Amino acid sequence: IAPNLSIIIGASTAAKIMGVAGGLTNLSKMPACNIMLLGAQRKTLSGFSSTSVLPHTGYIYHSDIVQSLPPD
Amino acid sequence: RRSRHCPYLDTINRSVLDFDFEKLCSISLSHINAYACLVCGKYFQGRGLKSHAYIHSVQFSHHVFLNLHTLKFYCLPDNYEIIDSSLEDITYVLKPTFTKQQIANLDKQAKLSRAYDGTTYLPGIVGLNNIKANDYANAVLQALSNVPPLRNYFLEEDNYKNIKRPPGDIMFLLVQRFGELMRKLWNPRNFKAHVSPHEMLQAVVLCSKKTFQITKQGDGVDFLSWFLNALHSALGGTKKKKKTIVTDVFQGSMRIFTKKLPHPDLPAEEKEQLLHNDEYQETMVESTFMYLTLDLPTAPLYKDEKEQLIIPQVPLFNILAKFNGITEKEYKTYKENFLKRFQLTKLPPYLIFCIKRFTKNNFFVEKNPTIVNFPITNVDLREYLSEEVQAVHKNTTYDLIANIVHDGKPSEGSYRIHVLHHGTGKWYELQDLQVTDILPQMITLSEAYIQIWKRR
C-alpha cells in the first residue's frame, strides 16, 4: 500500500496512522502538523503536571525511530 | 498407681508452650532434669521433694509437668506418672522423631500442615524468628534446609550420631543442634506456625569464636561457607572422613590454570624472555569447591542515552562464561597481576552459587546492584566442562531450588529467601515471620545473592 511510508517508520505505526486517518488518500491530504497529532489520547493529569502526561503526542511520537532519542 | 486417672489434663494449654527455649531451670539456671510446667511453659529444677517443680506446684496450683529429657509427664503435688495417648502431640512437638517412610515422603508430601493455633502451613517452609537483626543466618539456614540429601541425613538423630568425637570438641554441639532445629522446621504438628532459632544462634556464637554474632548482620556468603566447612569437619570419626555428607552434597572438583604475569612496565623482549623462563608459564591445579563465586561485571556508572537510569541486567551465561579455558581473569593482586583462568571438572550433585556483592572499594564497601537474568526452569552446564571429564557426567541440567536476595544498603539490609516446594512446585518467599507465595516469574527480578541448584 505505502512502500515509502512503511520504509520511513514502523509498519505497525504506518498501519495505525492510516487507520486513524481514514485511508492513504485521507492521510495524504492532511497537513504535516496534523499527522503527528493522530491517535493522541487526552490522558488526564492525575495531579501531575501536563508535561508528565506528554500531551500533543501521537503515534508518530511513539514510533521506533522517535523513541530512540533523548527526551529533550 | 493412680495413673490414667489424672483430673488435670484439662488445665494443659498448648498455646503457651514454647519448647524452642533452652532447657534450664527458671530459678537455678540448671540443665539437669529440666521439667516444664504445661500450665505456664516455664522450666524447673526437676521432679522431687522440695524442688523447684514441687514449689511451683504447691504455689501456683499447677499439677501437670513434663520431663524435658525423658518425654514423660508427671504430677508433682501428688507425684505420679502419666501414661496417656492424648499427650503424644506435646511429645512430638518437643521431640519430633521422623521415621524413614515419612522422611522419604517429604518430597512427595503435598498436604497443608495445620498448627494448633489454626495457621495452616507447609513442612520445611516455616517462618524463622529474628532476634537481634541477624536475618542472614536465618536465610542461610532456610536455604540449607531445602536440600533433600541434607534433610535425609540430618532429620534422623542416629544418622549423624554414633561417631567418634574429640573430647574437647564443641563443634559437634552445633552439628547436633542443627539437626534438632531442622527437624523442628520439618515437623508438621507444630503448636505455633513459626520456629525460633535462638538456641541455634547461641550455639553458632559459642562455636564461631564471637563471629557471626546475633547483634551483627554478617555476610551470607561467609556464614554459609564457614557453616559448610564446620559441618564437614565435625562429622566423621576422630580423623576426617574423605566423603562426609556435606562433601557429597555440595563439594565439586574444579581446575585452575594459574599463569604468572610479568610486570606490565617491562620491555617486550624482556617480557618474552621472562615468559620463556618457565616461571611465568601456565600451571594446572585441581581443587575442591563448596560453591562457585560469581563476579558481577562492572556497573555502567553512567545513564543510558536512550532510556536514562536503567538498572543493569546480565544473562546468567555471561557470568557462567567463567570456569573455562577461553575466558581468563586478570587478578590485580597488590604485588603483581595473575592470569588465572578456571575450568570445571566434576559438578556436584547440588550446586551453590554465591553472587559477589559487598565489594570493598579503595575507600569503603559498596553493594553491586546488577541483576542476573537466568532461566528458573533449567540451566545447561555441560558446555562448561572439559572434553576429558564430559564422558563421566550424564546429568548436567540444573533447576533452581533456593534463592537468596539482599535488599538495601550493606550497612543495613534485609535477607529474603525464596524456596521451591518439591511437592507442589510453588515458590514461597519468607522474610522473618512473614511468609508469602511468590510467582516464579519475578524470582529473577531481585538482587540474587546465593543460589541452590539441583542436578536432578
Reading the block at residue B215, the C-alpha cell is 547483634
What resolution in Å is listed for this PDB structure? Answer: 3.7
Residue B306 distance to chain A (closest CA, Å): 5
Residue A71 distance to chain B (closest CA, Å): 8
Is B434 an 8 Å CB contact of chain A?
no
Is A32 an 8 Å CB contact of chain B?
no
Terminal-residue alpha carbon distance, chain B: 56
Is B306 an 8 Å CB contact of chain A?
yes
Is A31 an 8 Å CB contact of chain B?
no
Task: Determine whether the annotation assigns residue B232 to a binding site.
Answer: no
Reading the block at residue B157, the C-alpha cell is 538423630
Residue A68 distance to chain B (closest CA, Å): 6
Q: In Å, how far are B138, B184, B194, B408 from B123, measured between CA atoms?
A: 16, 10, 11, 29
Closest CA to B404 of B215, B154, B150, B135: B135
Q: Which residues, numbered 50 to 69 in chain A, qualify as contacts with chain B under a Cβ-Cβ cut-off of 8 Å?
A: 67-69
How far is residue B179's CA from residue B144's CA, in Å, rounded to a whole number?
A: 12
Give the torsion sign (CA, B374, B375, B377, B381): negative
Cβ <8 Å between B308 and A68: no
Residues of chain B contacting A71 with CB distance shorter than 8 Å: 308
Which residue on chain A is closest to B307 by alpha carbon?
A70
3-state SS of chain B is: CCCCCCCCHHHCCHHHCCCCCCCCCCCCCCCCCCEEECCCCCEECCCCCCCHHHHHHHHHCCCCEEECCCCEEEECCCCEEECCCCCHHHHHHHCCCCCHHHHHHCCCCCCCECCCCCCCECCCCCEECCCCCCHHHHHHHHHHCCCHHHHHHHHCHHHCCCCCCCCCCCHHHHHHHHHHHHHHHCCCCCCCCEECCHHHHHHHHHHHCCCCCCCCCCCHHHHHHHHHHHHHHHCCCCCCCCCCHHHHHHCEEEEEEEEECCCCCCCHHHHHHHHHCCCCCEEEEEEEECCEEECCCCCCCCCCCCCCCCCCEEEHHHHHCCCCCCCCCEEECCCCEEEEEEEEEECCCEEEEEECCCEECCCCEECCCCEEECCCCCEECHHHCCCCCCCCCCCCEEEEEEEEEEEECCCCEEEEEEEECCCCCCEEEEECCEEEEECHHHCCCCCEEEEEEECC
Residues of chain A contacting B303 with CB distance shorter than 8 Å: none
Is A70 an 8 Å CB contact of chain B?
yes
Name the DSSP letter for residue A69.
Answer: S
Task: Determine whether the annotation assigns residue B69 to a binding site.
Answer: no
